[model samples]
Target: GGSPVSIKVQVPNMQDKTEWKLNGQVLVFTLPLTDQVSVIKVKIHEATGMPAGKQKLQYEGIFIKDSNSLAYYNMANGAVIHLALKERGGRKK
Candidate 1:
């Protein structure tokens, strides 16, 4: 129950044109600006099947930090958040 804003979430290099404007394959999410960057990662995970830990979000030239607020990044409604995948790493079976 907080003031909500809409942000466009996009995964670069992901070639799905579910919604294409100037940006392609973007999904819209509504959450409070007071929410942490981590909160939005989970939103993307649910929408795109990418693990939250694997998603790297950026805005402009800045890499978004999990503990920071959307407001801390000066994000408002209609902000475009870019998503990228972290380099693959895993334990041997």
Candidate 2:
């Protein structure tokens, strides 16, 4: 289990306001910071109906991970992160 951390996230092709705040017109969310990227992928898969294994996340162009700990990424408050739903087959590693 992991604690849900409040952060701003943008899913370019998605529109989930389930628990996110509205800042202007951008969609943001307060999601958990998992200890494994796979867990986050599961959430993304549930939201976008994409294979969790086919998802990728990053801030800017750099990839991120929750391995070791979410804190390992050094995410700051209100930090903006990107979720990319890779094409069918398998999300690139």
Candidate 3:
């Protein structure tokens, strides 16, 4: 018996028909519901190559249940930010 988790994903550079994978599953909705973890893992999959600039991936928060595990609440109610790759000059990798 696992707890219910809610995930909110935002992609600034995601284009139409582009797919993103979270723990190897394609994101169906902007916000996904699961019963996995108080902390969620997010991964991005881009069919098109990444642009040369500062990109970001973020996780809003993690939900946690009370003592009885009846009602879950947003525990770490803050944004987690991750910076994508950046290119310097003509050198792009």
Candidate 4:
């Protein structure tokens, strides 16, 4: 004999996880994805004191784009996202 499994679906939450690697030092924190990303960066700075342009955030090894919805990327609650600091002056080759 066997039994049955169960599952359900609902609206999304704004919280997420981060693998913070600021200045080569690893840290941990949670993020709230509640609105537009440009503005979300402000929240990130508020929470981590680190700005968006100064760092990069990735989920499942893919970079999370500015102004993109977390729901679009399926950023579930407690999901781990990778973070790393970037150059202050800009990008390089």
Highest-scoring model, TM-score: 1
Q: Write the number of the candidate with greater lDDT, choosing between 1 and 4.
A: 1
Ranking by TM-score: 1, 2, 4, 3
Rank candidates, lDDT, best first: 1, 2, 4, 3
Candidate 4: count of backbone clashes, pairs at least 3 residues apart or interchain: 0
Root-mean-square deviation of Cα positions for candidate 4 versus the true structure, in angstroms: 11.7
Candidate 4 local lDDT, 1-93, one digit each (tens)? 111111111111222334432333233333444443344445456455665676555655777766775555666454444555544666578
**Which of the numbered candidates is closest to the native, going by highest lDDT?**
1
lDDT of 3 by residue, 1-93 (tens): 333333333334334433332232223222223322222322333422343243333333232221212123331223232323323443547
State the local distance difference test value for candidate 2.
Answer: 0.51
| Candidate 3 local Cα displacement, residue 61, angstroms | 10
Q: Give candidate 2 misplaced runs (Cα > 4 Å).
A: 1-3, 14-34, 66-68, 87-93
How does residue 84 of candidate 3 score in lDDT?
A: 32
Q: For residue 71, give model 4's deviation from the true position in Å.
A: 0.9
Residue 69 in candidate 4 has what lDDT?
51
Better structure of 2 and 4 per TM-score: 2
Model 3 scores a C-alpha lDDT of 0.30
Per-model TM-score, in order, reads 0.75, 0.53, 0.24, 0.48
Weakest ten-residue segment in model 2 by summed lDDT: 18-27
The 10-residue segment of model 1 with minimum total lDDT is: 15-24
